[PDB]
Structure formats: C-alpha cells, structure tokens
Design a protein around this nucleic acid. Sequence first.
RNA 1: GAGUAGUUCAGUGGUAGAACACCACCUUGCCAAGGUGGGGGUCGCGGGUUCGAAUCCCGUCUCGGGCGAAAGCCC
RNA 2: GGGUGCGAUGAGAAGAAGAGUAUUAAGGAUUUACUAUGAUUAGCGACUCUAGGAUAGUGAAAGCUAGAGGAUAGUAACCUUAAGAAGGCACUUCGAGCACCC
Length: 81
Amino acid sequence: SYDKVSQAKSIIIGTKQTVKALKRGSVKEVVVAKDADPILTSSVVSLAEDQGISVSMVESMKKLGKACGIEVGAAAVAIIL
RNA sequence: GAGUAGUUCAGUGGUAGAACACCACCUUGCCAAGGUGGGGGUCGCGGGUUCGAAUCCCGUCUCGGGCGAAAGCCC
RNA sequence: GGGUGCGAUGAGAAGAAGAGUAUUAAGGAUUUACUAUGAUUAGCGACUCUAGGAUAGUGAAAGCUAGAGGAUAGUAACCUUAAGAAGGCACUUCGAGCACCC
Ligand SMILES: [Mg+2]
Ligand SMILES: [Mg+2]
Ligand SMILES: [Mg+2]
Ligand SMILES: [Mg+2]
Ligand SMILES: [Mg+2]
Ligand SMILES: [Mg+2]
C-alpha cells in the first residue's frame, strides 16, 4: 500500500527508527518491505504485533524508498500518525 | 643482464641487511595507529675452487636481449 | 553544472568509549630484557667462558651452532608527584547526505 506511504502526515524511515517509534506507541500504522532480510524484519513486526498495531507488507523496498522520497531504499517504515 | 626474508629492494669472497608485512604483550567490544620485544633466507638447483661462495668456476633450469651457419657464446 | 563511489541493512554530527592510556617532566627502584660498542698489534674479521663443530694464514684469544655469563653507555618494563591527548566500526540521541574528480 504505497498510497498510504507516499502520503500520510508523519512517517519515520528505517528499521531502527520504526523500532523506536514502536517503543513509545506513537505510531499508528507499520509498513514493512518483503524482499528485506527477515532477521531484521522479525524484530520489528514482532514488537509491532505485540503492541497490537496493524502491519501492511509491501512488495518492493526500492519502491518504499521512492515513496518516502529517499534515494537509497528502506527495510521498514513506520507511519507515526 | 633477470632468479636474495611473506612483498619490495640492498648487499661488488667473511654464514643475510633495511623497510614493510607477520606473531606476542602493552590490550580493552573490535580494528587502525603507536611502543617494546621475536621469527624468517637449498641466495633458481647441483658439483668444484677456497679455511670460507649470494659473490669465483663448471654443469644445469626459467625469463628478456645480443652474436653465430651451427655447436656454442655473450649480455 | 558534469563524471563516479557509498548511503535508512543508517549519510553526517555530537556523545560515549579509547583513558587518566600514549606522550612530557622531576625523583624513586638499580633487578630484568633489547640495542650499540670492546684498547695496543699482526688479521678481511675479536665482550669473555664451556661444549661440539672446521681450522689455510694471522694472533694472547677467531667467523658457525647451542648455552651461560660480562663491563660502558642508550633504551624500554615497575612505583611516587604534577599535568595529560588521538582515528574508524560497533554502541547512544538527532536522521540524509558524505567522499574523489574537472
Ligand atoms: Mg642467425
Ligand atoms: Mg641456443
Ligand atoms: Mg554514522
Ligand atoms: Mg563519532
Ligand atoms: Mg572513565
Ligand atoms: Mg575542466
């Protein structure tokens, strides 16, 4: 769902920043890219589900980057609405 | 002429030097830098000369080049 | 503006380390190791001693190997005092630029 990502009010970018966004429950929707290494994805989606927050996985992470406006690509993006 | 420490170069008859690299400690999450120490070389290989050969001689191996009809020879 | 490289699998900055460590002095201790050097005189060549080596010549004493032990300095290693730094990854906040080139 890049409609939700390329828009939205507040969005944090990067697995660490999404984990820090989860660590204070200020995030409303969590987006995670599929073709990323699951070793890192696991830790953020687990904490996400544990918090009880919705997770919307997306196909491409380069596309995630492009939707965020970033030029390098992201693994996880948190929408801190 | 080219072949010498792991690499790169010195060493022009006295058992192989420097630099860098490597190991150990300093030392620690981890490396770099650094400071002490340390280990390492059929000197292409084999005979001879000599008390002693990386050095001289002979045979021989590989590479680059020169001479020669070639064998050889020279660098 | 152009050509690359890296970058949310974290650019970059600060912090935290590194650390009271390196380094700089004054003493202290005077045992360790390392380095340099060893009168005259022959000899290319000498810190001394033992054991093998090998040994032509020179010398009171030879070059190798293995030990052990020495003076003269120069160093590091250990205490006390006063000062006292430094790069990167990783870590911790901020989170997107940084680097080489013309
Ligand atoms: Mg011819
Ligand atoms: Mg021929
Ligand atoms: Mg950084
Ligand atoms: Mg820093
Ligand atoms: Mg401290
Ligand atoms: Mg120009």
